[PDB]
Amino acid sequence: RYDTEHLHPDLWQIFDNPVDWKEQYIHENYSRALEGEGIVEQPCPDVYWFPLLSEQMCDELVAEMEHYGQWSGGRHEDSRLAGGYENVPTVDIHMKQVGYEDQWLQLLRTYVGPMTESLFPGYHTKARAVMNFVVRYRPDEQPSLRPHHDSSTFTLNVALNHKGLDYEGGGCRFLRYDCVISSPRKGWALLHPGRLTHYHEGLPTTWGTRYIMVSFVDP
Amino acid sequence: RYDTEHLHPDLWQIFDNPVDWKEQYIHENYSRALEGEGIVEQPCPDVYWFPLLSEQMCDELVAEMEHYGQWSGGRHEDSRLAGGYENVPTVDIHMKQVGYEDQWLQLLRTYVGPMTESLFPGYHTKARAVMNFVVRYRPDEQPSLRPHHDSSTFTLNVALNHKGLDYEGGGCRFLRYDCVISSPRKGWALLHPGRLTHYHEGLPTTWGTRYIMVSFVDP
């Protein structure tokens, strides 16, 4: 079985060929980082930064998102939310629309969960994520979000573009720790709690557009 | 209405005369701590220690618990829990049997919530609790519990006896932070998360009996 009615059939080939898809899409340092040889960075307290995604997978995801076209989001109300009122609006394409929610959940249960288990001892993971989407911020379409927390036990933020080369600006601004990650990594991702002890704030971008893929796990 | 069917009937008068209950049960330093002039201690990151109640309230609670008599708990399974199985057995009596569970919830909603809002900015609290019991720790009856996490957003620990003079032992040890509670205060209370970033193991009591207050807030 191979879905030929798609731009990148190899993106969904994780189910049919997990070994080949993992080798082609995951970061080269993902195994090294998981083995416990440094790699993971903690610029802020109770924070992490490890290489997860590769250039090819990021390019394929960006191409699929661009081909989707309907970049909804940016309204106070929410059509995909049961409550019907989103506290924070953002222009993004949900993983449900692209059909990659199942594949993303499988990848999180496979690779993301072991990293959380190793980083946090005594913590068991089930990889339950209710919100998963990729947001693209533009200098005139979507500005930096207001300082708000996350309604989940852990939050993962994965960049999809090179800093400066693709978009000019900054990253996050942790008010509690007085820390700003102004050097985002395209291949690396951060996984830190955001429920109570993290009031996250995003910095603005001047030139270009930066794509961020963030999912709310354990909600 | 003043029901005299109690050893200390004034313990249930939290709602009849709130001013009297506050002036005769809460700690005198609680107002100063809420005013934001120190008092609150931060022995470890994301950990708080501030006075909560007065000595008279603790003595009355201890006397009522002693008069209760039914200090059950100690088996892997349980009958109070809906599931019927307890992850960590402990000899404690829930306030539902005592009947002051509503009073404890009212006290939490009246004093605890605003302090949590002041301590952790940007977090809205409703003071919802389900699991709350007073556990008496004795070396010959119930030793220290193995390290585990808390099935709640926040965990509140309040001492109910004068350490040293009433019991000999230890407090808690933070496995991930190397934080050890060596000199707990009878009036002071412990406030820290126990879900993901904090795994705690209690120290073993040696002499006397140690009485502690446990309450699962926001589960």
CA distance B48 to B118: 12
Task: Give B78-119 as a 3 state SS string.
Answer: CCCCCCCECCCCCCEEEHHHHCCHHHHHHHHHHHHHHHHHHH
A214 within 8 A of A90, measured Cβ to Cβ: no
CB atoms < 10 A from the CB of A58, how many? 21
Instruction: Tell me which H or E stretch contains A92.
Output: strand A92-94
Subunit contact A120:B46, Cβ cutoff 8 A: no
Tell me if A148 and B195 make a contact (CB, 8 A cut-off).
no
| Sequence-separated (6 or more) residues with CB below 8 Å from residue B70 | B93, B97
* Distance set, CA B86 to CA B24, B74, B132, B151, B153 (Å): 36, 9, 14, 12, 19
Ramachandran angles phi, psi of A25, nearest 5°: -105, -30
What Å resolution does this PDB entry report?
3.8
CB contact under 8 A, B154 and A196: yes
Residues in B whose CB is inside 8 Å of some CB of A read 45-46, 120-123, 147-149, 153-154, 175-176, 193, 195-197, 199
The residue among A209, A206, A14, A4 whose CA lies nearest residue A101 is: A14
| Residue A154 C-alpha, separation from nearest chain B C-alpha, in angstroms | 9
A10-A12-A18 Cα angle (round to 5): 80
- Please report the DSSP string for B124-138 in residue order: -----EEEEEEEEEB
Q: Which of A216, A187, A208 is nearest to A59 (CA)?
A: A187
Please answer whether residues A156 and A16 qualify as being in contact, where contact means their C-beta atoms are separated by less than 8 angstroms. no
For residues A176 and A195, give the distance between their C-alpha atoms in angstroms, rounded to a whole number.
13
- CB-count exposure of residue B89 (10 Å: 0-12, 13-18, 19+): middle
B199–A148 CB contact, under 8 Å: no
What are the helix (H) ranges across chain B? 18-25, 28-35, 55-68, 95-98, 101-107, 113-119
The method recorded for this entry reads cryo-EM
Interface residues on A facing B, Cβ-Cβ cutoff 8 A:
45-46, 120-123, 147-149, 153-154, 193, 195-197, 199
- Determine the residue type at B31: S
Tokens 């088996």 found at:
B75
